[PDB]
Design an enzyme around this catalytic site. Sequence first.
Site, mmCIF file in Angstrom:
data_model
loop_
_atom_site.group_PDB
_atom_site.id
_atom_site.type_symbol
_atom_site.label_atom_id
_atom_site.label_comp_id
_atom_site.label_asym_id
_atom_site.label_seq_id
_atom_site.Cartn_x
_atom_site.Cartn_y
_atom_site.Cartn_z
ATOM 1 N N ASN A 119 -24.574 -24.730 38.011
ATOM 2 C CA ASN A 119 -24.389 -24.168 39.348
ATOM 3 C C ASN A 119 -23.000 -24.404 39.897
ATOM 4 O O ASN A 119 -22.810 -24.345 41.108
ATOM 5 C CB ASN A 119 -25.387 -24.760 40.343
ATOM 6 C CG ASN A 119 -26.810 -24.418 40.011
ATOM 7 O OD1 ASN A 119 -27.508 -25.185 39.345
ATOM 8 N ND2 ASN A 119 -27.263 -23.267 40.488
ATOM 9 N N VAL A 144 -18.927 -24.642 44.028
ATOM 10 C CA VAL A 144 -20.371 -24.815 43.940
ATOM 11 C C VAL A 144 -21.128 -23.581 44.394
ATOM 12 O O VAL A 144 -20.899 -23.067 45.485
ATOM 13 C CB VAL A 144 -20.821 -26.010 44.770
ATOM 14 C CG1 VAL A 144 -22.318 -26.143 44.751
ATOM 15 C CG2 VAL A 144 -20.199 -27.251 44.232
ATOM 16 N N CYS A 145 -22.041 -23.121 43.549
ATOM 17 C CA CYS A 145 -22.841 -21.952 43.863
ATOM 18 C C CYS A 145 -24.321 -22.277 43.960
ATOM 19 O O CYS A 145 -24.973 -22.561 42.947
ATOM 20 C CB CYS A 145 -22.631 -20.848 42.824
ATOM 21 S SG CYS A 145 -23.583 -19.318 43.125
ATOM 22 N N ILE A 146 -24.829 -22.252 45.191
ATOM 23 C CA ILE A 146 -26.239 -22.486 45.498
ATOM 24 C C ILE A 146 -26.629 -21.549 46.652
ATOM 25 O O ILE A 146 -25.785 -21.163 47.454
ATOM 26 C CB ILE A 146 -26.522 -23.950 45.871
ATOM 27 C CG1 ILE A 146 -25.369 -24.542 46.673
ATOM 28 C CG2 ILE A 146 -26.791 -24.754 44.639
ATOM 29 C CD1 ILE A 146 -25.613 -25.960 47.111
#
Length: 164
Positions: A80, A87-89
């Site tokens: 992620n 950060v990819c969420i």
Amino acid sequence: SKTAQKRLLKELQQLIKDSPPGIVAGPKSENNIFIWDCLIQGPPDTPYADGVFNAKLEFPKDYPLSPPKLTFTPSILHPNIYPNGEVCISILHSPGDDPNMYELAEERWSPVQSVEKILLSVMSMLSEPNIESGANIDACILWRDNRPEFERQVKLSILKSLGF
């Protein structure tokens, strides 16, 4: 921008007094509150446990309408986290086109979310990768398929970073 500042002040003020375990975040300058520094220690039973990671949190002018941009300065190995360190969420994302569906609630970004909710999401993220928002291809097929190697790999870098 002036509304975003009154907002960031409370969250900051609140975090400092009731600071989440293993995390310290905040700005460097008393005036530039749009850029925060973070020190996140890896949670207990994750291959991150021993590591401590530096991250930068950048807030837009229209906060809390738009989410900030969390990015681990030295990018680490995680499905992620993009190779550039971003950060990819889902918590760091816009609801979309039909924000009324039962899902969104907790998952997407809206003025009901705090920065603490983010740091909290980042924590469980290091424990539980969300392949739906995978940002790194390799890190994804490694964590998925050959996990023992993934945890071996992640633990090597934590060692290395300790001046070993």
